[PDB]
Amino acid sequence: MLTIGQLARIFEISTKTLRHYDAIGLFVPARTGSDNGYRYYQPEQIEQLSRILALRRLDVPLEAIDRLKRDGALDDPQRLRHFLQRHQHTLREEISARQRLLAELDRTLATLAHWRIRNMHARIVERPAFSVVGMEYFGSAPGDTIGQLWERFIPREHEIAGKHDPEVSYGICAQQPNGEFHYVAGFEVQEGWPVPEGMVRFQVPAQKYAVFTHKGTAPQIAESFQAIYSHLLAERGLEPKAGVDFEYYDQRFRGPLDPNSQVDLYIPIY
Amino acid sequence: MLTIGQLARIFEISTKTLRHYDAIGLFVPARGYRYYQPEQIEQLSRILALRRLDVPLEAIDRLKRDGALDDPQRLRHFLQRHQHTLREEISARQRLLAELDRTLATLAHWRIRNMHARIVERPAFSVVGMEYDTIGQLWERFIPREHEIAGKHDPEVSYGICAQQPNGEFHYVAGFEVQEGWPVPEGMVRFQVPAQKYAVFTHKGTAPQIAESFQAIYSHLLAERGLEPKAGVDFEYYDQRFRGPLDPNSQVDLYIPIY
Amino acid sequence: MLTIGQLARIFEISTKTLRHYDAIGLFVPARTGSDNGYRYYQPEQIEQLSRILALRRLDVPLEAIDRLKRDGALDDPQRLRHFLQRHQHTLREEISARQRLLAELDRTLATLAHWRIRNMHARIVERPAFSVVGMEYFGSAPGDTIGQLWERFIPREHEIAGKHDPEVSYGICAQQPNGEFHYVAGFEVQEGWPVPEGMVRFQVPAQKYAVFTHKGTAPQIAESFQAIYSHLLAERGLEPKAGVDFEYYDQRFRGPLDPNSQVDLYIPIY
Amino acid sequence: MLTIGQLARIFEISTKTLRHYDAIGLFVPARGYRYYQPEQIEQLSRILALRRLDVPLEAIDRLKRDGALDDPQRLRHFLQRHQHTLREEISARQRLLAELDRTLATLAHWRIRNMHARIVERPAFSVVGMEYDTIGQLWERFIPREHEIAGKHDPEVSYGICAQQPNGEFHYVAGFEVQEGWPVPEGMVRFQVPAQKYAVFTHKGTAPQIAESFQAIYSHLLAERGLEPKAGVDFEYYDQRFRGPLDPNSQVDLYIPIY
């Protein structure tokens, strides 16, 4: 024979959560304090109660519990199991609707993408050869990428002297003679200044450009490269010249992972 | 130029779902006839896959020319602020489902524990039915043939008879206890069940589960009551409390021979 | 004390599946028939075995089982639970990879769609008014659609007399004066023949058409209607005229749900 | 005009993954020097999302100009012949997971059943520690302060003390059994545990589970051994067998006062 205190100890509840139940008539003790309040619980009530405080863990309304125990389904192992299979069935169908509504979210996650990437503004721009000074990337260097280079660069943003435009930053995509991906983040510089250490100097040659205004993120760049080289050029009517392409970050760029930013894409054309 | 029905013929839209939006301001013909325009329809296709996830008619109404009615950039992270919401709305269910899958744990024992053994003596008797890879079909085929057996003693009571052949081999017979001397239909057979004293356990539930009660009976249930299992002719016993091999709310008396 | 027969009875196995185990040394009886083969099992072996024939239900190799019981993890409730949580963890991560590879299947399920629907051939066609005879649909009739009308029509395909072309079938999309969706499946007929019962007669007026060659299914039609009215017209450079549009089924149509079929889409233009 | 590296710079492709395809025939420059072309790249983008689901290099090789290398119609039903395959490859796991979730059922009882009570008498003793919404943090804060307590009798043994206040209220103290007379650090307190005869149950597992053993002990475990529960000072007992409040492979002696 047990008390409200040790019962709350083995169920980890407030002793008034039981008084909460005691007054409801939901979990009444097997004995009354008919005078000075000696309230005593029987050790069989433990599982009669343990089922309640595991049905509550299913968000079953505490009032929905009591109506089961008035019809008797709460002290019946057969009737309780039936209800619990129904509530089980409703849960997985709540999952089913939502599992089928995210297959429907990733199917519009490629329909949002293909509206901009088609409805994309472009203009033709020609430029003479210029000089970009900064640090470089290697498509084979273990443990590095575009987010990593622009991470360790921007602290050294001030070092470049002779900047041609402080608000304009370049991300160049050329190669080594082995076709390796030679990336350089840097600034257009006036031609007569010291190259810092350990920074490099890349000469972008004179090229004719198709300038596409990206709207999105830096990981959204590689796939917008695809549409341009794969299909958007022949659409627009122009031809890919082999040379040096680069992204063009501007005042209108407000973060690598901010989708409301923009990036200009300079691809060589004829 | 598109007319009010022509805005409806494109897809599965009612003629009033538009004037539904007119008084609101969610979408209005540009200019008592009313007019319609070319990419005024992208304004309505995005809404669809948004209403195909039940965005409120008022949620959109701000979401319109606040931005982004038109910016396809804010609605890409927005949509993953809703792939976020939904996939956690799912994950919530999983632990609920998982913890139910484990609340379904204690179910077996509150039943098995509350499974008492009644001791029953049955004089020898004879049952005719079908004899034997799966005992499931053995019932599937026999239940329609069930009115070919004459002289039934109680037609509601079928017997799932498991004989203990000495090899041992599985002998199983499903039939009805019948007065002797009646004829046996071809493809049926008359099994004679010897007189035995049984331990009778009422199993509550489902035909593939009853193996559970069997292991419970033979591991510890018989021991707890002092009874000694006896190799012989056990049988499953069915009556009005049997409502299918898959209904968790039906009862099957298991008849276990003892000494 | 039990035997191989009743043990197989309570586990629903072949009696040689136990002999299979008996020879392996995996489930040896607690006693030998040291002479005439009296093989006897103890009732405690039931759960010692019940764990095996529930681990087999997890496709755990029967040889992987035995090596657990040589190291002792099979008769230990603590060590078995640890292994079972690891195998649990691997299962959900098998789910995780595949649950994440179908969000990746429904994301390309809109990228496959937007290649054709952009790379879509079209030509301009002008036609005088003709007559189509068949049965009609109603966008408000309870329990009906395009699959249902073409279902109950094709059996009555022979009844139409005066056919202009037996291989060509039309699916018309006009209204009632209330903007309701008035669909008619039918055939182009020579103008002087009896209208069957209960079939109707729709006069398609003289119109200028943008003819788009659908590739897909009948449910793939409504969304190809979208791209045309929504964006593909201004792309192509022409204007939507209000009137009567229809699908055009041909020799090159090989089934409503056969994706390798084609359908010509006639939309009124200027 | 695109060069061999230029076919690689577009995406995350090695300079040899192409010549990988050259000898095969899966993709070859039209005419070490070799040449490249404009929608020869769609021929390679579809492959990606096909290799992003690991289609065999030889499966594709037929799938190419057999059809459909180019027909975007066969590869839409094909892809759902693989949404089919994968979503059943998942569903298979679920029943395995679900039936494991229910194989995890019988786990509790094979443990609880095999939980014996040792009867232990402890002369009165004193423990100093921290006193008390959640007893989880009560340990989280105290474990670093654990070397401020001087005069420890055994430093590996911590005590989770639950006093039975008459109201009743939750009194809980987490500390170390210490020789009396040493000083008590501020924000700690010295609890005196009376002399009691205990029933000691070794619990195998995890701090949020131990409520399980508590209900098992107080519902039927104490009865089965004739012992009478006694309101008093119970305490959880930790030692080298305790490896965290979430590790299912650690042991916690529960100390239950009896008559």
Numbering used by the authors:
A (entry chain D), C (entry chain B): 1 to 270
B (entry chain A), D (entry chain C): 1 to 31, 37 to 137, 144 to 270
Article excerpt on this structure:
BrlR, a member of the MerR family of multidrug efflux pump activators, consists of a structurally conserved N-terminal DNA-binding domain and a C-terminal GyrI-like binding domain. BrlR mediates the antibiotic resistance of P. aeruginosa by activating the expression of multidrug efflux pumps and repressing PhoPQ activation. The monomer can be divided into three domains: the N-terminal DNA-binding domain (residues 1–75), which adopts a winged helix-turn-helix fold; the long central α-helical linker (residues 76–119), which connects two terminal domains; and the C-terminal multidrug-binding domain (residues 120–270). Our most striking finding is that BrlR is not only a pyocyanin receptor but it is also a dual receptor that is responsive to both c-di-GMP and pyocyanin.
Subsequently, the structure of apo-BrlR is determined by molecular replacement (MR) using a protein monomer of BrlR–c-di-GMP complex as the search model. The final model of apo-BrlR is refined to 3.1 Å resolution and contains four BrlR molecules in the asymmetric unit. Two full-length monomers (A and D) can be traced, and the other two (B and C) have the same interruptions (residues 32–36 and residues 138–143). Four BrlR subunits assemble into a stable homotetramer which is composed of two cross-stacked dimers (AD, BC). Unlike other MerR-like proteins, BrlR forms a distinctive dimer of dimers. The head-to-tail interaction of BrlR in a tetramer occurs only between two adjacent dimers (AC vs. BD). Helix α1 and the subsequent turn of the HTH motif occupy the groove of another BrlR-C domain in the BrlR tetramer, with helix α3 interacting with helix α7′ of the BrlR-C domain. The unusual interface of BrlR tetramer causes most of its DNA-binding region blocked by the multidrug-binding domains from their tetrameric partners, thus indicating a lower DNA-binding ability. To our knowledge, the tetrameric BrlR reported here provides the first example of a self-blocked MerR-like transcriptional regulator. The blocked HTH motif and the long distance between two recognition helices hinder BrlR to approach and bind DNA, thus resulting in a very low DNA-binding capability of BrlR.
